Design a protein around this ligand. Structure first.
Ligand SMILES: [Mg+2]
Ligand code: NA
Ligand code: NA
Length: 385
């Protein structure tokens, strides 16, 4: 009459409360024991059936007590289930249906509970359901700006299901995959040795390459754990893929370059998939009195020992070199323009190498506002002669 059960249903991804999990409540009476389920209410008491198809479905986010020959239901806190007016005795709270975009965990599906005599304190139980949170980061970058060609460290992370080794007859999880799709202007460095080799981890342990397969789609890839190795993954741990991409020749400073990741396990995924965006920088100048024949280089410091900007003709990758000979020269045509693209943000110096030859460098900033978008390019900075 006065005993009660209070359940918190949570997801494994963020310990978040989950509504719409469905439970039945059983007891065992007899020798040998016959199982019975709460079916309904009659004369201040719960009625019982041995037919599980007729068992009352208690749903998380609702509370239930005995009414006049029917259940009195009300809305409960998120992921909470309250069942009042239980008689003294031992019971099993049995999960029969997972919430949307959640999966059952085998050792969470049957929760024993005891209602004690003369005890109105709610009995507290927690029940976990597997959910997915995917994370994507660039753990080495100072900000968001990069040079074209610069190898960028990426990390994709997902919580590993608590039920990763559960079995249905026939494992519960027959695939477990991380997927990335990204801008055409990003190229995944599919490299299996050296500084930029990718790596798949269970916690801090490296998974041997034969236990997964990397495949590339159009502007994306999939990391697929081998079906036979999935039950070895750490339940509740983290699966982490660490890799490198770079901006290719298609990149320019007018767009952001995004990637997005998610998990594919047959069961659950992230409804708000993680994205990362990176940008590159640029600056435009126009030589005027528009003058052609003007040649320049870019220095990374206002000094003679500074480096020189180098732009690879094929990849458009931007690097710094120690001599003028190794530098890229920008020579103005009739339009008078100098179009410097693919730099990291920062302060740089334009140096005229070939009217009066300039006697000082022109300091310029590269940043979010220095170049523009394709529709509205920022006016080139005039260089008078
Ligand atoms: Mg999300
Ligand atoms: Na899951
Ligand atoms: Na820009």
């Amino acid at each position: 009459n006065d005993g009660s059960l209070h359940v918190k249903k949570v997801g494994t991804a963020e310990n978040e409360g989950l509504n719409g999990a469905e439970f039945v409540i059983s007891k065992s009476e007899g020798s040998p024991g016959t199982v019975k389920y709460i079916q309904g209410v009659k004369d201040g008491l719960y009625t019982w059936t041995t037919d599980k198809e007729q068992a009352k479905r208690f749903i998380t986010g609702k509370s239930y007590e005995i009414g006049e020959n029917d259940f009195t239901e009300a809305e409960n806190g998120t992921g909470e289930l309250t069942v009042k007016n239980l008689e003294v005795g031992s019971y099993i709270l049995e999960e029969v249906k997972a919430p949307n975009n959640a999966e059952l965990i085998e050792n969470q599906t049957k929760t024993p509970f005891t209602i004690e005599a003369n005890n109105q304190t709610p009995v507290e139980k927690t029940v976990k359901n597997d959910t997915s949170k995917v994370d994507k980061t660039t753990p080495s970058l100072d900000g968001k700006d990069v040079a074209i060609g610069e190898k960028i460290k990426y990390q994709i992370s997902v919580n590993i299901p608590l039920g990763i080794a559960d079995k249905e007859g026939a494992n519960k999880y027959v695939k477990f995959n991380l997927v990335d799709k990204h801008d055409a202007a990003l190229t995944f460095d599919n490299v299996t040795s050296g500084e930029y080799a990718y790596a798949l981890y269970d916690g801090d342990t490296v998974i041997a390459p034969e236990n997964y397969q990397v495949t590339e789609q159009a502007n994306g890839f999939t990391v697929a754990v081998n079906p036979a190795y999935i039950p070895t993954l750490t339940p509740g741990g983290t699966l982490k893929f660490v890799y490198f991409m770079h901006l290719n020749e298609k990149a320019d400073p007018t767009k952001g370059f995004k990637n997005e990741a998610n998990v594919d396990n047959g069961h659950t995924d992230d409804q708000t998939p993680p994205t990362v965006e990176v940008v590159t920088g640029g600056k435009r100048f126009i030589k005027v009195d528009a003058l052609a024949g003007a040649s320049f280089v870019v220095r990374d410091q206002n000094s003679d020992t500074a480096n020189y900007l180098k732009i690879d003709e094929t990849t458009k990758a931007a690097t710094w070199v120690k001599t003028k000979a190794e530098a890229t020269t920008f020579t103005t045509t009739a339009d008078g323009l100098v179009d410097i693209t693919g730099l990291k943000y920062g302060t740089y110096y334009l140096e005229e190498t070939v009217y009066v030859l300039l006697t000082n460098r022109i300091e310029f900033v590269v940043n979010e506002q220095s170049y523009g978008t394709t529709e509205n390019l920022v006016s080139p900075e005039k260089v008078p002669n």
